[model samples]
Every structure is written in C-alpha cells, then in structure tokens.
Target: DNSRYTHFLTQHYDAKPQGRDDRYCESIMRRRGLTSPCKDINTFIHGNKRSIKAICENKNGNPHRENLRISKSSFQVTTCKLHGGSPWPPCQYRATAGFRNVVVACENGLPVHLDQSIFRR
Candidate 1:
C-alpha cells in the first residue's frame, strides 16, 4: 500500500539540506504531519530518493541482513531532538547536522524505517 510509502517518506526522507534551527524543526515537523506528543527524535538524510531507494535493492552490494540495508556512502544528515519534556502541545527542537551512514529497514524494495545513524569518531 502507498500508506507505508507515505509513512516512510514522511518520517525519513529529505532531499535537500534545511536550516538546522529550532524554527526549521517546527516547520519541518509540522509539514511532515508530526503531532501529538511530538516525534522526540528524528533524522533526515539529505539526498535524492532514487539513490536512497537503491540501497534497499542492494545496488551496491548485499551485506546479508534481513530487511535492513546500510547506505554505501555517507550523506548529510540532520537529527532533530525535542527537549523540555512534555507529551502534549508546544514542541521545540534542537537540530544538528552531520555526515553519517544511514541504516534503514526495507521491505518490498522500499525503505520502511530508519534503523540507525553511524558516525565515525
């Protein structure tokens, strides 16, 4: 169903870098249809959807993992964090950007969830 695709795209997809600011987070979260208790934490990988999808199909190589694929190359990532602790109303976020390896869960040749973000120290 396209619902899964919509959820996947809404939760983890972002093709371009956005301002790593509190306002940006609010706008982005709102635009993505996040609400009620807030998302708490989310990571946005900046790149084309085509390349991101290829990771699921193992266009690079099959590393042997069930329903999970790690990106072949690091991409610009913005991780947004919600703070101050409240499950309802008025959410604020701290946004940070970096290049990291994005690990995602895939099904039916599409990314269904973000599993992890790996950064080299």
Candidate 2:
C-alpha cells in the first residue's frame, strides 16, 4: 500500500496552494477513501512537469534525503466551489482543471536516480 501511496502522491495527492471548498474535499476524500469525519488539508500541484521535475531532481536545491527525481508526470487537479444547501455523508466536487507554479513530494529511487548534482546548497 506504500507504493500505492507513492503513486497517489505523485499522481494526485500533492500540489501547490490553490484554493478549496467543502465540496472539493468532501468528494475527493470520500471517493479516494479518506473520509468518515472528513479529513483536512489537501494538495493540488499547479506546476508543470519541468518545474516539478526540477524540484524532484534537486534542481531547485539540495536533493532531499528522502524523495528521488522524477522522469515523467501527469497532473489531475481540480478547482473548488461553494454550494447552497446539502448534507455531509455524501459530498460532491466539480472537476476543475488549471495550472500554476507548484510544489510536490517525490519518492521512489530504484526506477529513478537523482544523482550527486543533487542541487543542494
């Protein structure tokens, strides 16, 4: 399941600080199996592959001791909106898409490298 988390982080669960509404968190957390009382805090990276890759590769700074560099990327981010009246248990979210300069948490090394250049100061 760790690998699944890893994939989830890279593919969906991480991102820059855009903005989110209740509906956004409700639907995503529920559908993604992260609900019950409804958790808090979510990430939706707005950066492109190059920007994010630069970060993963340590291009932005000293390679993080944990995360490894990334080779490819595909982003799935959405925007949030407010609703009039409804309920909890079942929430909804509109799939809003866009872009921005983002930050992400990168891991997994075997299939990737992220050499000594590491970009550390």
Candidate 3:
C-alpha cells in the first residue's frame, strides 16, 4: 500500500521538496478508504459524513484546538468543529445531506474551509 501511495504522490506532487516525505499522506490513505493517495488533504478527513453528522447534529460543544503539523517549520493550529464544511451553500450537512459530491482543493495543504456561520447559533 505504501508503495502504491508513494507512486501516486510522486506523480501528482512533483513540486514538493525531494526530501519532503509523504508519510502523513500514506497514513491517511491507509487509514481512510479514499480513492487515491493524491487526494487533497480535506478528502482524507477520518470520519465519514454519517459519523460526523451524528456528533455535531445539535450539540454546541466546547471549543478545542487541533494541530496540523505539516512540517517542522510549517504547522498550523486552529479551533475547529469535529465536522464542519466551508461556505454557505455547501456546508457539511447541506452538501452531504442527501448524496452530494465531495470537492477537494489544493490550496494550502488541501484545506477545506466551512462557513463561519456554522459556528454561530
């Protein structure tokens, strides 16, 4: 599996530093049943639509910090919901509510931003 993923990674992300390994990408691919190792970071989120929906259906939980340690020098930590999607029209619940396509982007390590409104009452 690692071999397959590594191959895909090299093919798609040739610009990545040669020494920059794709261990994180491999872990995510093996753990998740995502289509390819070249999948954007957002597509590698662990929980599926159903699992995420159950957790945040109507509960306003305490804020928590999650860390994204992309590299030793490139990391980001932010507060995020267990399950949230970006923009108004395609919120996690709204987009995946009844069979919707998942969109993946290559911006800033494959980030998928959800609407700020979701955090509001």
Candidate 4:
C-alpha cells in the first residue's frame, strides 16, 4: 500500500532539499513516527516521486538492494513487506545512507514511495 511506502520514505529518505544535518533525520523520524532514536545513516531521494516511480515501470533498465551489496541489476519496484504479526514501534532498521539519485513515485507533494533503484558496477 501507498501508506506503507510513505512510512518507508519518511523514515528512509528526505522530502526535498530537506537535508541539512544529523538533526534532519532526527526530526523526520520523530515527526513521521519512526523514532525514539532515528537510524543514523539513511538515503534521501530529493525530487518528484512520480518520475522516480515512472523509472520503475519503464526502463533504460537501470538499481540497489538493502545496503548490503548492490551492483548492476534490473530495475524493479521495491515494496514494503514488513512482516505481519511482527513487532513495530520498537522498529529497528539497519540502514546506511547518503544523498543520491533515486527513482520513486508520488501522488502529490508529500506522498512519496520507492519504486526501485539502479547501481553502477
């Protein structure tokens, strides 16, 4: 659902030219309800989400998995599969991020979601 992706976006990426400092993540995580202590390293996709999501459907065929190991791969929309019956709120995401180009989808100004990502080999 869009809402789940919205949560992922708010928790993971910045809204726009929203990045400033460490406190950026601190506030976003708290305001968006991913808090207590926000994850330190996280990516921010600064653009209109529509274009990002569009990249997923059609492709020059360009994309990242979770911050493990990513190389050249097919573009695909990544969805939230947060486990059912699993505990949240005490949620812990092992994310390490930086400012980078991202492809995503958006409804309006705020509803942002990740469709997929591409990486260079």
Best by TM-score: 1
Off by over 4 Å in 4: 37-40, 60-99, 102-121
lDDT of 3 by residue, 39-82 (tens): 22322223233322222222312222342111112111111222
Identify the leading candidate in terms of lDDT.
Answer: 1
Per-residue lDDT of 115 in model 3? 24
- After TM-score superposition, the amount by which residue 78's alpha carbon in candidate 2 deviates from its true location, in angstroms, is 7.6
Native-to-model Cα distance after best TM-score fit, residue 62 in candidate 2, in Å: 4.5
lDDT of 2 by residue, 93-114 (tens): 4434543323345554212222
| TM-score for candidate 1, residues paired by index | 0.84
Question: Candidate 2, after superposition: displacement of residue 53 in Å?
Answer: 4.4
True lDDT of residue 113, candidate 4: 50
Provide the TM-score for each candidate, comma-separated.
Answer: 0.84, 0.38, 0.21, 0.43
Against the unseen true structure, what C-alpha lDDT does each candidate score? Answer: 0.72, 0.41, 0.26, 0.40
- RMSD, one per candidate, in order: 2.6, 9.5, 17.0, 9.2
Which residue pairs clash in candidate 1? none
lDDT sort, best first: 1, 2, 4, 3
User: Candidate 1 or 3, higher lDDT?
Assistant: 1
lDDT tens digits by residue: candidate 1, 2-121: 577669888778887557677777778777877476877787778878877777775742443665678786777777777778766577877878886678777777778776434221
Q: lDDT of candidate 3 vs native?
A: 0.26
